[PDB]
Design a protein around this ligand. Structure first.
Ligand code: ZN
Ligand code: ZN
Ligand code: ZN
Ligand code: ZN
Lengths: 306, 310, 307, 310
């Protein structure tokens, strides 16, 4: 079963049918409820797994995502997951079909906009005995996923052993900060997506710290989950092509690429049979505590509530 | 060829890309007569049927004239008697809300209501699947309707007008080349509606070369403010049963209440007694007004021309 | 064919007493009744029936109705057929209704507090997260889905509006309601649909003409709820159609006084058996239903009706 | 398909019922390229040629826009420099009362001159053979011209209009989304002529989302009260050597005195010395104004839509 939230994007008109392009990872029961293709298209992130090894033989993999924000980009083009008070500006929902707009409105709990879409679609002819049950299928699937990830849904089993503080100052004191308050403000599905994409900088398991990176690559500010380093210039993150070129093919866009000139093949062969260190930018931020007694190694998503 | 659907309502389609709809149109829709409407739609919307009034010359040389019979029961009163509503009350007489938007657009064009058609424009432009293919179909419907209207509008550019014929719907001074209040009301109608009224409502009198042929001695309809209405100018309304109608299929999910009249006696033997006799039909034709054919004229023409008002 | 009765789920929350609720076959007929005849009888003291309205030539159409199962000798909370949202926990003995039935009942009356209390109470059990979490979630999901089906305010919930139904027939001819209708509006969408299904209108104005079916209501809508008492005089004789109805708990001991007739009625039996029978019963007649000139009153698929 | 003639002047046909006429529209008339005028008719009437301006980027992608070179000699002065006359001076620039009928009717419609076209109808109606061919041909010409104009008039019912493009001809405040006197005059123009100016006159600046591409450093045309004119906003006019042979011969009988220019001296050896190098054309393109492409746009769209300003 497709678990990508954006799997329900269809055309409210009956004739044209649109099976949204979803990567094969959509059907996996991983913590994610979004596919890699859609995560790239909308939240401009790529899914990856961070494997943590012990000393002798045991490796457990956590999830992580790498953002796709160029260093040159600035402003509203750096936010990966916008906040509910600015998302309608970062996302150009107007040019996003109608089903995608409905899903986005539901993700951010904008029932008013959803009802406006409802009214607009009720006015048109061929809605009652046609578009109805189609908008209903979209809404039902989206709400099902959102309540699956919402810990407050009725009788919704919620994990509570593990804690996640996106502010590392007082994390060892068992307490978050302003970023953590903003995180709590988010919708359950968005909170889960952030907890998946953004790996914790520190990992306190059984009182043992396992600091992974020495500096956070992202920040949770008011604008949202920004792909900005809190020190000096932004990280060089080259993105080549063929990820979102599905964008309207008639939309003429300019792009300032940065090419290297010169023969690199001799240098390449000089040092070729070496393990290559990847140059992506992972999403590292915050602190995660496993709390000794727990069930961290459970192969089934359960909502995590701080 | 002359076998194009000339019924104005032939363009009715679905503004969505599904639910393909072929508007039920009677065969007469393809005939090049001046009706510009099919019998099926004439019955369904304007509740009239397409008859023909043959005027016989004494020697042999008969000629025909279009005439319609209305389908208004004598029991019905109010806005249920209006056959062709005026441009003001039509939105009330016709339940435009309860019909396909294509029919609504055609109707709004028939009454020169630009605001309503533009509102339909905007409502459709608020649709996701609008620019894909619905734009082309709605534009086609508008183009066909406008073309029909220009065909019937005598004020359209290079619109040939046969002014040899004068029709007055108030026969008081019609003999004095003059109309009345009903005629002024009739002038306000759109060209298509004017032609439809002329086709449907035969004149009581016909003046040809000073010869006055009086067909009926009393009008069966009236052009009042509400529009062209099926009601006698005095006394109770004419008994008019119709039985079969468009209510068949139509709206099978809508439950409607009708009180009907029926006879409860054996009539087969009475029928057999009066079996092989000429039958006088008990319909109600639309008779009203006066019509003059000037000594010099082209009244016996085949191609329709938008006859202009007095 | 999918079970439509709202009480269809009712599954033990312990995964030990596994049993299937005794829904009657009519449970699988989507006829606007989202409850089966057996459950309607057991819980709401009503039996399903169809009221056929004939014209004078051929075309007859059917209309749902219900007969209540309240004896004339009953008084107080025993006469209430459908309790209001503020007294149901008193009329219904929800304690002796397992917990799935209690959950369904709490949802029917929008008593989310009691629903959450049931959930919190059941979270303690050591067998919770294994399977009872999912069983409770399934029951809740089915119940909420049915309620949305019958609730016209749900998102994109197509709602019929060419049909008006009042229960205080004083200004119904004025297209206006009354205190009974104000109480009716307070009900949950499912319960409003159930009342409209069970309580036939004594008047049926089909766009010009009043079809008066009964000349007095056999039920009322008061604060206590939908009640089987007559608006005037002693209650209607209703001999419970005998033991036909059911029995629930063999262990529970209860005394019932039953009116007995005496005499050899067999001779009169055939003498009148040579004739057509008029059924006594007691249908639910109350209020005024108007069908406008334009409508889809003969629409097969059920759609919620909103006043 | 490509068998419908999109040129507006294609409908030109003699109103008389005897003498035939075949408009010499160029093959380019059959392409749906946004131009609704063919290259030869553009040359004959508006004194412009049809060129394509290709804009490349550093990579292996490119896109082409339309542009036109005017055919106004440097020595021309007065109303001879006007390429597209305004609605007021057009009857003074064009010699309408010389190009028989039909073409005159199209010209009157292009400038929304209802009175003049009605007068044309009035004059034509008195002809002996009016109800014969003449009325048919005149009606066909009017219908074709009206359809062409509606295709471009953004204010037509259900007429889709693009609004991701913003075109100005005033530049001084184009960076502030605001036009000026030239833009105000441009708005007064007919929709077809607005589209024709947009096609012919390439923008001096091209601003896509945020990057500004400057094509020319000085406009070559102007939009003044007399219309779109081929005068520079500078000193002596650009030297434009008219190719006399290319320009049609029009009227063989009419005797016109033309003071042509002539270069003297042998130049074949110079050509041989400079044969092989890419030649930079000496045409004079139409550059003026400022064009903005919204970040969300459908610029690379095949089907033409009227580009009404926001
Ligand atoms: Zn996806
Ligand atoms: Zn028809
Ligand atoms: Zn049941
Ligand atoms: Zn041409």
């Amino acid at each position: 079963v497709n678990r990508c939230i954006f799997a329900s994007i269809v055309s409210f008109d009956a004739c044209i049918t649109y099976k949204s392009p979803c990567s094969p990872d959509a059907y996996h029961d991983d913590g994610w409820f979004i596919c890699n293709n859609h995560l790239i298209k909308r939240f401009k992130m790529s899914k990856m797994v961070l494997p943590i090894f012990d000393e002798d033989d045991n490796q457990f993999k956590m999830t992580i995502a790498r953002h796709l924000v160029g260093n040159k980009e600035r402003g509203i083009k750096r936010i990966l997951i916008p906040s509910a008070t600015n998302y309608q500006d970062v996302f150009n929902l107007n040019s996003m079909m109608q089903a995608e707009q409905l899903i986005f409105h539901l993700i951010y709990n904008n029932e008013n906009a959803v009802n406006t879409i409802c009214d607009n679609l009720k006015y048109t002819e061929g809605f009652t005995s046609n578009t109805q049950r189609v908008i209903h299928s979209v809404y039902a699937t989206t709400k099902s996923i959102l309540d699956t990830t919402n810990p407050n849904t009725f009788c919704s089993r919620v994990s509570r052993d593990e804690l996640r503080f996106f502010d590392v100052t007082n994390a060892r004191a068992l307490r978050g900060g302003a970023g953590d308050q903003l995180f709590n403000n988010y919708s359950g599905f968005l909170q889960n997506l952030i907890r998946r994409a953004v790996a914790p900088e520190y990992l306190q398991i059984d009182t043992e710290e396992l600091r992974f990176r020495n500096c956070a690559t992202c920040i949770i500010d008011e604008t949202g989950l920004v792909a900005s380093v809190p020190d000096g210039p932004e990280l060089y993150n080259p993105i080549r092509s063929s990820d979102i070129m599905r964008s309207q093919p008639n939309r003429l866009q300019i792009r300032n690429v940065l090419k290297f000139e010169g023969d690199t093949r001799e240098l390449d062969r000089t040092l070729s049979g070496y393990e290559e260190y990847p140059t992506y930018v992972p999403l590292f931020l915050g602190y995660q505590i496993i709390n000794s007694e727990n069930n961290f190694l459970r192969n089934d998503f359960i909502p995590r509530a701080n």
